[PDB]
Structures are given as structure tokens and as C-alpha cells.
RNA sequence: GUUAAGUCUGGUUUCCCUCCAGGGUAUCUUGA
């Protein structure tokens, strides 16, 4: 079945919100939600996407936790309170790209964990730039509302 | 394409005022954020691309990760210096823009106040703006179509109004710049750089040790290489209006506020200007 | 044209016996129309001496003095220590202009020698502390104007505007 | 000849430009630009007419009666205004570009799509029937272009590929230089397939985040932060100014519509926005 | 029937009382003046997210609502707009309760969990097409009431 | 000021030769630069009298005649039925401007008396029938613009700039 | 707090004797703003005895008393036994509020014991016949007040407010 | 008195809209 942008945002934010045990992680995630949606317009989905992947500071226990979050209901993001927020926003964007079927899941989890695939992932993103950029900003606006509603300020 | 990506830094250093700096930095950031990826798998790096330097330089042999994480900071500093020395100012298009616009406004029966101001100390404007934010975390108010940094007209007007209402009362201020129930009587345009001495963008750093720290026990430097605006860069902008009254408080305020700040970090003396020239063309 | 006298308004009061014409001619240019002071004037680059109120030329452009531009001529025991100008009313730097001006004036500013014996260190002097504004109406508006307590019930308005509109820089030395 | 005159013109933004649609709950931006039913920027003819009429009523005070008759009385309306504006449809919008292998270096390029040209052709085809004024030159150029529909092309330069708005890699094909000058400038003009040009254009407007400073703290007020979409400088909007038969219509179209060149559209007039030049197709095509 | 024009009076009375500072009143006026058009144009889930994002739900200010439900001397506490949005959220939830669209017990045990709050939002998402049609006249009544009973700031 | 006489552009033939200085000088208003005819003049309030067409003056602002401006004299056998006058070029209702013409021009206009025996019911007219375009080019343009058929390969541009660009309201009695 | 003698506005001429201090202190509460009489007070459930007007209290909300709340004392002599209060100045229902609420007032009112002689049926008195209105202006609005009929270029424009702001009720005994 | 080696850190946090305008004027049996 096809879930719309707001239903998808609810389903994702529910997985995320229940994985950031530390509350500082929650508030940092909120501050990411509020500004990355505008950064993506101003700079582009691809630059900002890889900027998120870098700020997430992956390649740790912070990666299998992410790939388990796709189906664990117990997976717990861990790391600095600024790394977990970016890793959660990365999960948000990957959840969109996967549920919308824009990109395969296993291809994404492969392009994340090592380098040879990251470049062809860049190429794939440049191919699907209009497919993605058409409608992701509404999903991210939904996430922004959910975040700045369900979380208190820092 | 990734071909456009690998070949971006030579584009920067070989176009130097005719490459779109916004797009150029936004694309350089994909290389910067994927460093350990572009440095693997016998890439299609030419013998002049600025990236195979890091295949030579060896900063750490014990660890493959730490070598890359050090090369990445080296590369960030190198990109700052690249943008700084290559992208310089050609201000003929800005002179054309401002003189054409001045003729336009003379054709609309406005009184114009052309104002040239010169940067004294390395300035920052729009630090939370997005230009280098994906690399440096600290942007610069940039205009991706004039391809030049600028000072927003709203910012100049707001600073001028804060001054005027500091010295003439928040009621004369509202008489000049209007309120939520009336229109303003003065209009400002953005300030674009018209002439530099040698550079436009210059690197800088900010290393907080004890910002939001509890004790000497968690202090740790966190340096922030960003880009600022060179000294001696000259910005000009127009100030037009209809009733000449509002031209009296713009006369005196302007040479007084510029010697204070006009951008960010001015409490540590950064965004300091000086009124290079002023000129009124009355058209009553 | 007509003569015009500039009654500076710092917190001090040294303005009692200075002018040959107190209520002026037919009218002043400064008004009191239940909206506070109108057509109040600003003078930049000069500071006032809190003792023997006099505008001194201190070339710093941040220095300013706001006062009232009244009708009159200063007592003719003077004109050796004042400035006198004919200005076309567009050179004036007014505030809250609620009318029209003769478009060529005769202004009388209480001048001072720049005192080249001690340096000129100025200091911003605002106006607050009602006991200092209580008597501004009792000194420089009941003599300068007659509207004081014949139809004025909005005294609080001009009080608050004096408390906020009029500021200046004084040499404090 | 339903209309006595049909004056199609081009709107050139001298400065950045902001006509607003007001905030809605589905935009991420507080103050967004006006939008077509397709998604492209536009200037509702309400805004066009209001701005132009408010300007004319001050520039030509003695022709005030003619202005009123042709563009509608303000108070006490007793007749239908003779004049007619159509929605200003986006002709071409600047778009910052990166390309390798081009002789001339471009920092930005004009961009349009095929549905926009189809809207222009619809306007021209529709007003040539409702009036005695056909424009067989715009129509010729626009169909010359439109014949190439379904493939990204280029008119005024030789780019074989580029990256528009730092997110969209496009592969172009040059059009023969027999095409006359449309924009009458020195910048190339890409014409993208609409499913791409849609993104490339709606991500080609400037979003300027502004703030509101607290007085005594000299810091940002709370809830004092918002964004605004402007449209780049030198953007071109195509519109038409139709007019029904009368004598005031003649004096309008011969005396007013000539000595008119510069107007102020939109809002934000006091931060240097909104200045616009109207080039008439009849005059300078 | 027109009992929505009466439920509207009930909820508006409760709000009008609970906005003890007149600025909150003058602000809720504008909220009622805007959000009905927003629900007409954009739909219910977009505008509901835009409302809950600016209402600033928290156990403190969400208790000022659960008390407002039953009690009569509750006082909505917060900034002016911060409470002009929570008053409107109260309007909505009050209609959804007094129309049995959702069960008051299921709501109160969800306005507190900090966890089943997302589940409240989802439950609402399932009913969006129904609510979007049911609440129209109720919200138009609230708009008229606010325009009349409250003078412009 | 120089001499620039106004030859109109009808669908008629009786106005083949009406200028005494065909080639004129460099001072020609109406020009052609492969973007087409430029600086076409238009006179509103005047209707053509195609039988030896002299622009009949009426008062209807809706009646216009679009003809071109050419330098020349009225043949010295005239000024008894022309309108000759000196405009500052701030009155030249020029269609398709190309270059900013300086100032202070002197125009010779074909003119007629009202001749009120009849009554004016002027009707719109336009140019078609490409053989008529041939004649209007040969007998008016080429007799003025020998430039065409010298450095031009696209006759179709000027051919189309008479189909659309030129119209008039003839008297039609 | 501060004292308040509320006068009643009758059609009669006895209101001069309730107080000798007709001004009060430094403030008149009911103003003259050239838009009419502002800061007016009206109280419900009351009436006015036609003889020596004093508010006979009843239980009728529709009844009211339309008068002027003067700032100051009832000369310490009158209203020493009548309905007097001290209010937080908000429960003081001022109509056409155009000023600062003093945040507390101690009000004196012309009160009459419930007049237990007859069943008191109300009678609406609607001021007209401007002789009463040309009278009240001289009786109090120059004796009570101090800002009328001195500068007033408009004497009858502020006199016509009484027509449509003070129509009280009576019992006509 | 000498030998050699540098190491660590590499942006965070707030603010994401506030106020007014929410429609006005004109038109409202004829035969049987």
C-alpha cells in the first residue's frame, strides 16, 4: 500500500523518536529537523545528503544500529549528542528513499558502509535528482512539524 | 556527473571569477564530505588535479583512518585558500548595475544617495547563510547571480533604524521608516563590492575552548576554519526616497554607524567599515 | 524673514533671562498639539555646557543637542557670544514637522568659545527621573508658550516625550 | 476585434522581486512567491494591474480620467474597466550553472521549459483571434523552438552538458543560430523538458532568511525569524495588456503605454525590491 | 442539525474564560480567523501538524488543557501565540470528543503518556477525511464567534 | 533642425513619387538592420484620403496612419497645403524605436483641408496582397532604401514588416 | 485612594451645591477631547429623584444614571452620609474610555434613601430643548470645569454631546 | 654533552515567524 508523505513522516518519526534514549539527542534531532529542510533547498539534496552522512560520523557501532533500526523496534542510536541527531536525520531521509522505492534498501546499506559504492551512489543520486527533489521537501516539512511539536527546546 | 565532481578544483582555479561560486562550493562539498571515497580505487585523477597530492602526502602510516581524517582538514584549509586567492573581484558589472539602476531611479523622480563604504577589518555578513556551510559550517551572504557577496538591504536599513531610534526617539524613527500600520519613506538597496585591494575572501579561524563548558576538565579547542571578507573591499549601495525630509537623518547617521559594526562578531571588532564616499542627487 | 532663538533643553536650567522677546512674535515654529512637541530641532557636532548653557563646537559627528527654536531675539545684552544664521528652512534638521516654515530664517544659537585650555571630553546625558522633567514645563513652556493649563490636560504626553525625545551630549567639565 | 488593442509585454526584473501569496501551512517558507497552477512562478494579474494602475495614477495626474476609464474607477465604480491584464507567465528565469568544456564561461544561464512556451503560444494565439493584432514573429520563434519538444536544447550558446542549480545534470543539444534573438541579450537560454525544468526552476529562486532584533538585548527576538522567496534579477515574465474599443482606450494605448517603462511590482519596496522594466513586444520584440 | 453552533458556544466560552490575558484573546481571534481557511485549502492533517507544532505541547501546558476539559477555572498558560494555538487545539479536540469521533478516555490517556501522543496523532490521521467534513461548520461558528466577541488588537 | 518628410504606407499607388530628396542624407529616422524596419511614425487624429492621399485631419483619437520618416524637401511646389512643424522629438509617437534620436526635429506632413461637403466615416484598412507589398517596396522603400537589394539577402523580413507593422484608417467616402 | 465626587446630570439647577472644590486636584477624569465627553460613568439599578437629585436605588438593570465622575472631594461636607464606595477602578464601568485608569477610586454619589412613600415607577428623561443645554455649560462646565468656554472655538459642538450621551430616568414627583 | 620524535582538538546552541486586514461598495381570467 502507498502511504502519503504525512503518514510516512509519522511512521518514520515514531521509529526515530523511540530510538533516541538520551533526551539531549532528541532535542538535537529537533534542531536538525528545523534547519536541514531549508539547507536542502538552498544547497541541493545531494550536497546536503552527503553533508548529513559526514556529520553523522558513521562507520562505528553507529552503523549497524542504523541498519537494525530499519527493523528492530529496539535499536538504540548511540554516540555524541550531535552525531545521533544527524544519524537519525539520515535514517529519516533513507527511510523516505526506501519506502518511496526511489532507491533499493540493500543498495543504500551497501553504499553507506564502504567506499567503492559511495561514488556510484553519488551517480545514482544525480540520476534520480528530479524524482527525489520533486516531493521530499513536503516529507521533511512534516518531519519538522512533528519534531518541533513532540520535543521541547534545548 | 562524478566527472564534473573530480574536475571541480581546477575549474575553480582556472575560471576564478566566471565560475558560479555558490554552485562551485556546493559541489566541492561533495568531495570534501566523501574524502576517503574520492581517495580510493585508482580514481581518474589527472596529473594536475589538486587531489592526488594527498596520495603522495603521508600524515600517518600506522592508521588508514587517521591519515584520511588529517588529509581532510588539510584539504579544508586548502579549499579556503583556493577560494580566497582564485575567486577575486571584478567590479565592472557592479558599476554598470549601479549606474544603470541610478538612471532608472532618476527616471522615477527619486532622490538618490549613493554610498560607498570600505571594509577596514575582516568582515562577516550572513554567517548563518549557506555558502561554505557544507564545508566550513559558517557561510557568507552571497548572491549566486551577481556571483558576489553582499550586505542585504534589510540589514543596512535595520542598523540605520536602530541608530536613528536610539538618538531621535522610536517615534521619529517610525515617522521615517514607517510602522506596522504605515509605509516607510526610505528605500535601501543591497551593497555589492565594487573594488578590492587584492583579495575578496580571506580565511579565518575561531577556536572556542570554554564556550558552554563547566570546568577546565572538559575544555578542548575546536577550531573553525571559515571564510571572511578581505579588508579594503569597497561596497556601494543606493538609498532613494521621495520627500527630502528623510534625507536629513540619513545624512548624519550613515557616517556614524559604519564605524561601529555592520555584520557579525562585531563585539570583537570584525565587521568594521568606513564611509568612503557619499553623494546625494536631489530630484525634486 | 524673522529672528529665531534656539532654546537648548538639557537637564539643567539656565535659560531664564536671555531673550528680548519671550512669547515671540505671532507664533513659534515649535508646536504643542496634544501629540507632544512638534518641529523640535536637532543640532549635530555641538555640545552644551550644563553650566552657562552654550553650544560649543566639538567636531565629533556623534555629538548632538535637541532644543526648541523659538521666536525672539536675545535681549540685546548679547550677540557677542551667540551664532546667527539665515537658513532657508531646508537646511534645518527638524523632528516631527507639523506645519510649514517661512523657507528663510534668522536663527540664534547660544554659542561658546571652544575653550582651548582644557580638552573637550563629552558624555551622553539622557533625561529621566521625573523631578527633573517636572520643572521643564515650569521653566521653558509656560513662559515660552501660554497653552500651559488653559486647555492642556495631556501634560503627561509632553512629559513622556521630553523624557524620551530630548537627549544630548554634554562636556560635563 | 473584441479588443481595440493587444499589447503583449515582457517584465524584466531590474532588481530582485517578491510578489507574495501569503503564508500557507504547506510551504516550508513563511513568505513564498506567487505560483502558477503548474508550479512555476507567476504574477497574478491582480498584482500586475494594481501596481501598474497605482503607478500611473501618480505619474500621469492629468490623464487620471483616462486611467480610470481604462483601468477602472477606484471609488464609486459605475462601469467595467476597459483594460485587461493576463497573468504574467514566467518566460525565462536565471539559473546558476556549472559546466566543463564551454569556451565562454557562464555563471548563470536563462532557463525555460516547454509548457511555459506552450502557455505563451496559447496567449498569443488567443489574442490574435480576439483582436486585429497578430504577432507572426513571436509565434514563429516559439514554434521554431517548440518543434524540438521532448529534449533539452540550447539557443544562444554551445553547451553539451551542465549541472543546473548544483543538483541537476542535463545533457543539451544546440539549436541552429538561425533562431533570432528573443531575450535580446548575450546569455544562453536553455529549454528543458518540463519534468526536469520544473525542479530546475522551482529551486532557482532566492530564499533570504531574515530576523528581528530585540532592542535591549541586541539579540534575536523569539519567533523573529523567517524566509522569503525572491525571484532573481533579470527574470522575464510575459504578459498581455488587452483593451476594449473606446476613445480613452486609444489615448491610453498611444500616450500612456508609451511613456511607461518602469514600475514597482510586489512588496518589499523599501529594501530595494520590486523594480521592473516593461518591454513591449510591439516596440522591441 | 445546528447543534454544532451550540457546541461552538460551549467550547468558545471555555476558551474565552481560559485566556485570562487579553492578548491571548486578541491572538486566538486571528488564529480562528486563519486556520479555518487553511483547513479548507490544505486539508486537515497539514493544518493539524501546523497547529500542534506551534502549540508547544508539554506535560505542563497539556495539563492546562486536560483540566480545562472538565474544570471551569483552568487558565491556559504560556506566551500569547503559544496559548492562542493551544486554545485552538482545545477547540478541535473538544469537538472531536463531544462528537465521539475519538473517545475522551483514549485522548486523556494520550495527552499525558508523552508516548501515545504519536498514537493520538496517528489515530487522527486515520479519520482525517471524516473530520475534514464534520468540523467545517463548527470551525466557521468558532470563527464568527471570535470575530464578534473579541475586539481587534 | 533638418528636413524629414513623412511618407505614409498605404495599399494604394498614387503616392509613388512625393519626395524631392529621395536618398536624403545619413539623417534618416526609419532604418533597417536585418531586425526589420525601425522608428516608424504614427499620427493619431488623421485619416488618409487615398485619392492623392493627403492625411485628412479629424478629431477621433482612434484614427491613425503609420508611415515612415524620410529626409527630404516638399519639392518647393508646396507649403500651401502641407502641415510643416518643428517638434522636440518628445512628441514622436514612434513605433519600433531603435536608436535614441537626439532632439529638435522639423517634419513635413501631407495635409488636407476637412472639405466638409461630405461626412467622415473612416474605416480601418490594412496591407496584404503581396504584389501590393512588391509595389510599396519598389516605389517607396527602394526609391528611398537602395540599401535593400544591395547588402540584404533576406527580403522576407521587410516583406513581413509591412504585412503586420503597417496599417491605417482611410477616409472611405 | 484619590477622591471622586460623582455629580448627577439633571434637567434641574441644584448641582452647584454638592461641593465647593469643583476642580479637585491636578486631574479632571471626564475629559474634553474635541471628540466629545470621555471617561463618562453610568451606573445601573439606580434612578434620580427629580427634587434635589439623589440616586434612589432600585433593582432594575434597564434603569441607569448618566453623569460626570469629577476627580476630587465632595468638599468633605456633602455625601457624608450617602452611597460612597472605593473601587478597583476597573469595576468602575467607564463608557467611552479615553484615559488612564487610576487603578483605584474612592467615589461619592448623590444618594437618596429608597423613598418609601410611593411605588416608584420610572420615567425616561431624554435631554433636549437646548436651553437646559445652554444652561448646564455655564452652571458647571465653567465652574466645575476649567477648559471650556475659554479656548473653545466650538461652544455648541461639545454642548451637543449631552444630547446623545446623557438621557437618564426619573420618577416625576 | 649528545640522538630522535611530536601528539591531541577540527563548530556547537537558540530563534523558523509576530501584528493588522478575513471582504467592501452597487444591483434585490377567456369560452362556455
mmCIF file of N, CA and C in Angstrom, chain C residues 56-110:
data_model
loop_
_atom_site.group_PDB
_atom_site.id
_atom_site.type_symbol
_atom_site.label_atom_id
_atom_site.label_comp_id
_atom_site.label_asym_id
_atom_site.label_seq_id
_atom_site.Cartn_x
_atom_site.Cartn_y
_atom_site.Cartn_z
ATOM 1 N N UNK C 56 28.927 74.440 22.086
ATOM 2 C CA UNK C 56 30.360 74.508 21.815
ATOM 3 C C UNK C 56 30.662 73.626 20.608
ATOM 4 N N UNK C 57 31.459 74.083 19.657
ATOM 5 C CA UNK C 57 31.807 73.247 18.503
ATOM 6 C C UNK C 57 32.817 72.173 18.877
ATOM 7 N N UNK C 58 32.350 70.931 18.951
ATOM 8 C CA UNK C 58 33.212 69.769 19.146
ATOM 9 C C UNK C 58 33.036 68.852 17.941
ATOM 10 N N UNK C 59 34.052 68.804 17.084
ATOM 11 C CA UNK C 59 33.894 68.341 15.709
ATOM 12 C C UNK C 59 33.441 66.890 15.575
ATOM 13 N N UNK C 60 33.236 66.203 16.687
ATOM 14 C CA UNK C 60 32.777 64.821 16.633
ATOM 15 C C UNK C 60 31.351 64.754 16.106
ATOM 16 N N UNK C 61 31.085 63.999 15.036
ATOM 17 C CA UNK C 61 29.731 63.979 14.467
ATOM 18 C C UNK C 61 28.716 63.236 15.313
ATOM 19 N N UNK C 62 29.138 62.494 16.334
ATOM 20 C CA UNK C 62 28.172 61.808 17.180
ATOM 21 C C UNK C 62 27.486 62.749 18.154
ATOM 22 N N UNK C 63 28.057 63.923 18.392
ATOM 23 C CA UNK C 63 27.538 64.843 19.392
ATOM 24 C C UNK C 63 26.345 65.596 18.831
ATOM 25 N N UNK C 64 25.265 65.656 19.603
ATOM 26 C CA UNK C 64 24.058 66.320 19.143
ATOM 27 C C UNK C 64 23.360 66.959 20.328
ATOM 28 N N UNK C 65 22.578 67.995 20.037
ATOM 29 C CA UNK C 65 21.763 68.681 21.032
ATOM 30 C C UNK C 65 20.418 69.019 20.415
ATOM 31 N N UNK C 66 19.346 68.623 21.085
ATOM 32 C CA UNK C 66 17.998 68.952 20.656
ATOM 33 C C UNK C 66 17.425 70.043 21.546
ATOM 34 N N UNK C 67 16.804 71.037 20.921
ATOM 35 C CA UNK C 67 16.169 72.109 21.656
ATOM 36 C C UNK C 67 14.935 72.640 20.959
ATOM 37 N N UNK C 68 14.463 73.808 21.375
ATOM 38 C CA UNK C 68 13.277 74.430 20.804
ATOM 39 C C UNK C 68 13.700 75.682 20.057
ATOM 40 N N UNK C 69 13.191 75.843 18.839
ATOM 41 C CA UNK C 69 13.514 77.007 18.017
ATOM 42 C C UNK C 69 12.365 78.000 18.145
ATOM 43 N N UNK C 70 12.564 79.022 18.969
ATOM 44 C CA UNK C 70 11.506 79.930 19.351
ATOM 45 C C UNK C 70 11.620 81.218 18.544
ATOM 46 N N UNK C 71 10.585 82.048 18.627
ATOM 47 C CA UNK C 71 10.621 83.397 18.090
ATOM 48 C C UNK C 71 11.158 84.350 19.148
ATOM 49 N N UNK C 72 12.072 85.214 18.743
ATOM 50 C CA UNK C 72 12.663 86.168 19.656
ATOM 51 C C UNK C 72 14.033 86.604 19.177
ATOM 52 N N UNK C 73 14.681 87.411 20.021
ATOM 53 C CA UNK C 73 15.989 87.985 19.785
ATOM 54 C C UNK C 73 16.597 88.135 21.173
ATOM 55 N N UNK C 74 17.838 87.707 21.379
ATOM 56 C CA UNK C 74 18.361 87.531 22.753
ATOM 57 C C UNK C 74 18.795 88.810 23.463
ATOM 58 N N UNK C 75 17.814 89.629 23.848
ATOM 59 C CA UNK C 75 17.949 90.558 24.968
ATOM 60 C C UNK C 75 18.873 91.736 24.681
ATOM 61 N N UNK C 76 19.597 91.682 23.564
ATOM 62 C CA UNK C 76 20.496 92.744 23.118
ATOM 63 C C UNK C 76 21.577 93.107 24.134
ATOM 64 N N UNK C 77 21.662 92.362 25.232
ATOM 65 C CA UNK C 77 22.864 92.316 26.050
ATOM 66 C C UNK C 77 23.806 91.232 25.557
ATOM 67 N N UNK C 78 23.611 90.800 24.318
ATOM 68 C CA UNK C 78 24.205 89.591 23.763
ATOM 69 C C UNK C 78 24.622 89.921 22.335
ATOM 70 N N UNK C 79 24.765 88.883 21.509
ATOM 71 C CA UNK C 79 25.244 88.880 20.124
ATOM 72 C C UNK C 79 26.762 88.916 20.070
ATOM 73 N N UNK C 80 27.442 88.951 21.213
ATOM 74 C CA UNK C 80 28.881 88.742 21.241
ATOM 75 C C UNK C 80 29.251 87.289 21.511
ATOM 76 N N UNK C 81 28.310 86.484 22.009
ATOM 77 C CA UNK C 81 28.569 85.092 22.360
ATOM 78 C C UNK C 81 27.595 84.132 21.687
ATOM 79 N N UNK C 82 26.849 84.590 20.690
ATOM 80 C CA UNK C 82 25.889 83.746 20.001
ATOM 81 C C UNK C 82 26.314 83.526 18.557
ATOM 82 N N UNK C 83 25.702 82.524 17.934
ATOM 83 C CA UNK C 83 25.769 82.354 16.493
ATOM 84 C C UNK C 83 24.462 82.819 15.876
ATOM 85 N N UNK C 84 24.560 83.411 14.691
ATOM 86 C CA UNK C 84 23.410 83.965 13.995
ATOM 87 C C UNK C 84 23.472 83.568 12.530
ATOM 88 N N UNK C 85 22.382 82.986 12.032
ATOM 89 C CA UNK C 85 22.338 82.433 10.689
ATOM 90 C C UNK C 85 21.000 82.733 10.039
ATOM 91 N N UNK C 86 21.031 82.855 8.721
ATOM 92 C CA UNK C 86 19.834 82.900 7.895
ATOM 93 C C UNK C 86 19.803 81.605 7.093
ATOM 94 N N UNK C 87 18.841 80.737 7.401
ATOM 95 C CA UNK C 87 18.800 79.437 6.766
ATOM 96 C C UNK C 87 17.480 79.228 6.037
ATOM 97 N N UNK C 88 17.511 78.593 4.874
ATOM 98 C CA UNK C 88 16.316 78.526 4.021
ATOM 99 C C UNK C 88 15.314 77.444 4.399
ATOM 100 N N UNK C 89 15.404 76.927 5.628
ATOM 101 C CA UNK C 89 14.408 76.035 6.226
ATOM 102 C C UNK C 89 14.430 74.634 5.634
ATOM 103 N N UNK C 90 15.215 74.430 4.582
ATOM 104 C CA UNK C 90 15.541 73.084 4.143
ATOM 105 C C UNK C 90 16.848 72.594 4.738
ATOM 106 N N UNK C 91 17.726 73.514 5.143
ATOM 107 C CA UNK C 91 18.933 73.145 5.865
ATOM 108 C C UNK C 91 18.640 72.717 7.293
ATOM 109 N N UNK C 92 17.545 73.194 7.876
ATOM 110 C CA UNK C 92 17.170 72.784 9.219
ATOM 111 C C UNK C 92 17.065 71.268 9.309
ATOM 112 N N UNK C 93 17.297 70.758 10.512
ATOM 113 C CA UNK C 93 17.246 69.329 10.789
ATOM 114 C C UNK C 93 16.203 69.189 11.888
ATOM 115 N N UNK C 94 14.944 69.119 11.478
ATOM 116 C CA UNK C 94 13.810 69.161 12.379
ATOM 117 C C UNK C 94 13.402 67.754 12.801
ATOM 118 N N UNK C 95 12.392 67.691 13.662
ATOM 119 C CA UNK C 95 11.806 66.440 14.123
ATOM 120 C C UNK C 95 10.325 66.686 14.367
ATOM 121 N N UNK C 96 9.477 65.854 13.768
ATOM 122 C CA UNK C 96 8.025 65.974 13.883
ATOM 123 C C UNK C 96 7.537 67.317 13.339
ATOM 124 N N UNK C 97 7.862 67.571 12.077
ATOM 125 C CA UNK C 97 7.434 68.797 11.409
ATOM 126 C C UNK C 97 5.926 68.752 11.207
ATOM 127 N N UNK C 98 5.199 69.583 11.948
ATOM 128 C CA UNK C 98 3.741 69.637 11.867
ATOM 129 C C UNK C 98 3.258 70.935 11.232
ATOM 130 N N UNK C 99 3.944 71.422 10.211
ATOM 131 C CA UNK C 99 3.477 72.614 9.542
ATOM 132 C C UNK C 99 4.355 72.996 8.378
ATOM 133 N N UNK C 100 4.325 74.285 8.055
ATOM 134 C CA UNK C 100 5.187 74.863 7.041
ATOM 135 C C UNK C 100 6.080 75.917 7.677
ATOM 136 N N UNK C 101 7.204 76.185 7.018
ATOM 137 C CA UNK C 101 8.216 77.094 7.535
ATOM 138 C C UNK C 101 8.413 78.211 6.515
ATOM 139 N N UNK C 102 8.874 79.366 7.004
ATOM 140 C CA UNK C 102 9.000 80.577 6.197
ATOM 141 C C UNK C 102 9.963 80.423 5.024
ATOM 142 N N UNK C 103 10.716 79.326 4.990
ATOM 143 C CA UNK C 103 11.666 78.967 3.940
ATOM 144 C C UNK C 103 12.860 79.912 3.856
ATOM 145 N N UNK C 104 13.030 80.816 4.819
ATOM 146 C CA UNK C 104 14.277 81.557 5.007
ATOM 147 C C UNK C 104 14.210 82.178 6.390
ATOM 148 N N UNK C 105 15.165 81.852 7.251
ATOM 149 C CA UNK C 105 15.012 82.122 8.674
ATOM 150 C C UNK C 105 16.092 83.078 9.172
ATOM 151 N N UNK C 106 16.098 83.289 10.487
ATOM 152 C CA UNK C 106 17.156 84.021 11.179
ATOM 153 C C UNK C 106 17.314 83.349 12.541
ATOM 154 N N UNK C 107 18.262 82.427 12.642
ATOM 155 C CA UNK C 107 18.398 81.568 13.812
ATOM 156 C C UNK C 107 19.452 82.144 14.743
ATOM 157 N N UNK C 108 19.246 81.956 16.046
ATOM 158 C CA UNK C 108 20.128 82.479 17.085
ATOM 159 C C UNK C 108 20.490 81.338 18.023
ATOM 160 N N UNK C 109 21.716 80.849 17.922
ATOM 161 C CA UNK C 109 22.183 79.707 18.705
ATOM 162 C C UNK C 109 23.098 80.222 19.808
ATOM 163 N N UNK C 110 22.904 79.811 21.055
ATOM 164 C CA UNK C 110 23.818 80.248 22.114
ATOM 165 C C UNK C 110 25.177 79.592 21.967
#
